[PDB]
Design a binder for these strands. Sequence first.
RNA 1: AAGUGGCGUUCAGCCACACGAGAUCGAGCAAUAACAGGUCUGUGAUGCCCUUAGAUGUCCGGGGCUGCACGCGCGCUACACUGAACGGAUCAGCGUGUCCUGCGCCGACAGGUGCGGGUAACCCGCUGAACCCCGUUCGUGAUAGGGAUCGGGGAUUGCAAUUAUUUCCCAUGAACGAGGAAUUCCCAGUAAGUGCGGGUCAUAAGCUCGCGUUGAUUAAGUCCCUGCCCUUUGUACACACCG
Lengths: 182, 137, 136, 59, 67, 85, 134
Amino acid sequence: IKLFGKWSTDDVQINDISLQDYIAVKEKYAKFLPHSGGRYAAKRFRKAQCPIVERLTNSLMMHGRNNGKKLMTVRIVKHAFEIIHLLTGENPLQVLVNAIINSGPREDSTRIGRQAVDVSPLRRVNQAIWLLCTGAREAAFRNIKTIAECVADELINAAKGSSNSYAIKKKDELERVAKSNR
Amino acid sequence: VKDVNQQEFVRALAAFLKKSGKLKVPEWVDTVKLAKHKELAPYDENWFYTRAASTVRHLYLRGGAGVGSMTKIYGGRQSNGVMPSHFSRGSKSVARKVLQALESLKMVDKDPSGGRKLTPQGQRDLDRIAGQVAAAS
Amino acid sequence: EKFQHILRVLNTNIDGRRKIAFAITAIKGVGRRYAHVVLRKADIDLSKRAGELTEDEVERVVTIMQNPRQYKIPDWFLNRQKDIKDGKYSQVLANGLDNKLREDLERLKKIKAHRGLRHFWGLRVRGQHTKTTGRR
Amino acid sequence: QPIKLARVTKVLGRTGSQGQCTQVRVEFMDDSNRSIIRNVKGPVREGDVLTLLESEREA
Amino acid sequence: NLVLFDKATYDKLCKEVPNYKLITPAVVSERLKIRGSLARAALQELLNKGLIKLVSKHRAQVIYTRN
Amino acid sequence: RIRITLTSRNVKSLEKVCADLIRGAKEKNLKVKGPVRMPTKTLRITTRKTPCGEGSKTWDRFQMRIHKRLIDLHIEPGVEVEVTI
Amino acid sequence: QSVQVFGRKKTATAVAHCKRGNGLIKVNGRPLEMIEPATLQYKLLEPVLLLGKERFAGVDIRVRVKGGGHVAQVYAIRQAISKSLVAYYQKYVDEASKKEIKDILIQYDRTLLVADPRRCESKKFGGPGARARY
RNA sequence: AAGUGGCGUUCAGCCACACGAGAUCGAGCAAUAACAGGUCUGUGAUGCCCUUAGAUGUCCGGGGCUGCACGCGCGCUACACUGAACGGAUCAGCGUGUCCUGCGCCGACAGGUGCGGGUAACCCGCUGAACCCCGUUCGUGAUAGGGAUCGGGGAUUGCAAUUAUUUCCCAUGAACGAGGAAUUCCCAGUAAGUGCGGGUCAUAAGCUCGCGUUGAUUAAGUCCCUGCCCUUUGUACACACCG
């Protein structure tokens, strides 16, 4: 059986048919660690085959301080899934994929010199991971709350639509702007 | 000394080296800091036992090191304030006095070619501790 | 129990909530290095707050803090060593630090030395380029 | 109105001042009819499934 | 904020913290209004007794749980 | 035993005299060791192109490669030969 | 009966000495699960967890590594161990067992048997690095 | 762009795949022609002018180029817990060396001292680099963040450091809680982090030229902006709109 080591990769379903192809989890992209370095920044649609646990790891290295520090963010995601499995008995991999389902803006606005336009299925998961890691990062900038706790809370609130996640508040903000500018 | 975790090895070897109350432990172990690039003295009171356990472990892996080598092994980054940080060697007298302390225990002798190497007695004592950490894990 | 939130050591409020090794650093003339060595000579557990100390242990720290050479502290560790007037190696404390810092500035001024005139003129004295920096 | 689910069939070209929106003719999956054209933001290719929040206007 | 436990705070730690989903020196420091130093050493005592377990221990991340 | 050191700046002329040395000594029934090729040395000199300070920070890189080959047995211009014992 | 296959990261050259015997896998004399980076411990165990310990229970592997960094040696060790077993199953076992091992290691990650040619680019004048400028 | 599929005047080529160490790798070189671009302070390259012995020659002292209400331009360090420290462990490459440096002693450090090796794949050197990793305390806190500004001492370089050459130790602990209008660089081992080496160098890196280390987000698109190029068009311009 292929696992992260304790958390199984199977039984992880994807609700949205759109993001089902652009989320690499089950039966083909299951690895023990979110760190393979498979040259996914080579062609146009290579990052779509990269596992979302590694893309979540790559997006946590966002500052001049964290650049080139991935083994740290692997430890952060490793500890975040411990808190996720501890707070909610469900599979932490299921919480992360459910977070992308709710943190993906379906429509966006473009500036004309606005106009509501659709969002590609790859830009949804691209922006969902970007919004999730941005919320957990700002939540731990000046706080005793560690990053593994902020990432866990950012993911459990996004997977439930609690409207407290920084990604959910930004995802609904981008949609209500396109709703009035369509 | 291999086949076990090297971080718990130096902690158990220092406990054996402290329980065997024969180490030198110079008088200035409370005032000195281990390098010019360090800001504070070691937090641990028995830092001379921790460094001696780690020093004899490096001689097991790479003999003929000497004081100049252990000064480079225990070196690190030196913050220069508003200037970029560089590498800085450790303390020479601390590395020299900790080498002579191991020689008083007959675990280290002068290497004929270069500096100092490990003795058959020190190689035996290090393998005994290496067996205790394996059974205790 | 019997905790002291604010200790009064050498007319200086020491925060009892901080650790013993760093709460002393609030005293002028002592830093993170001199505080640890003084608390190392006097056998006191460093894993306790400043307010957790007894009144007897605090007074013992003040003795070593004001008399470092008596308790086997080398001369290279003192901030006021080899004085120009009396040559007495000592550690100037909170009140004695400003009296010493002000005195040598007056000595460098009454002799009309360069480093004394730069202090009176309110300028950089260690050769810094003041063309683009030091603008308050 | 429900959230319609369409599938990309043909990528026409790049629209917008800076070419940020891709003009794609996206048909629905419930039936072969309604091969509407949409403007999509982001990397799109033939075979993508779009989540159309509003499917009345073509634009 | 609090550096040393009090009778009203120490009893608050021993009765409801072992009933938390996530037990961490950071989450117990925010609700008990204690500093991280006291919150970290306090959870080590509950681990020795048996009121709490240990999920994963690290340098800057120690995760406890309930029995 | 004689060790012949061969150092030159051009590999073609350096291996030309190296092959003639091995072939010239192999006919004399002398057991020779093959040509040991020392790691090449590149003399880097990165200078400023402009003779003043107005250039757009354009530097020019120079190289002077020195190939070294030794022959242990029991000449063209640009090749240095030095025999030992 | 032994082979010596090398795995190359950026500058980490790890050479595995796959020799017949028992299930011994050591790196510079130290066991495989004793390498200092514990975060990348599963990356070193991928050839063993995928192929199973029964395939390694007949060969000793002693990897010697030098060059590169901590992470580069990790990917070079797991590549040397992956290719040393393939080269062993090619010269001393039937070719059918070699394809039974290659198809498992290639389908998971091609970097276990094929080294990537990515190397650091030369710095250009007028900039802090290869691409970036002042 | 060899094979396969697709798109194409089924052309030139493009896209997607199989195979494979790779399916646009990084410099160098670089046309016609132009600048009133830089350089007389690189030249025993040089015209002319000027100074020529109370000298603008030349040497030796001392000072200056470091001078500081200020307005800007490249940078470094930060504003932390994705962290500072303390300790453990564990990995480079480029390159230099008549000066580079190894060992045994002295010292807290910076140093000193004797014995040595290397004109070098030989010795420094298995370059035990840093970030990183693993423990340990610190716990919105201008704080164990930040180490600017100053005091008192120890050394080293040199003929000589005061306007602190550098360096070490103790103490002093400032602004700075991601930064206005604006604006820069960048598409893969790239950005960024991290340290090393070379050049300068008696003393010597916050610069620069290289090197490895860790290693991404986004993008495979467009004339919207800003830059040039070309065609068409107009000219009383042709020293060419600085007309």
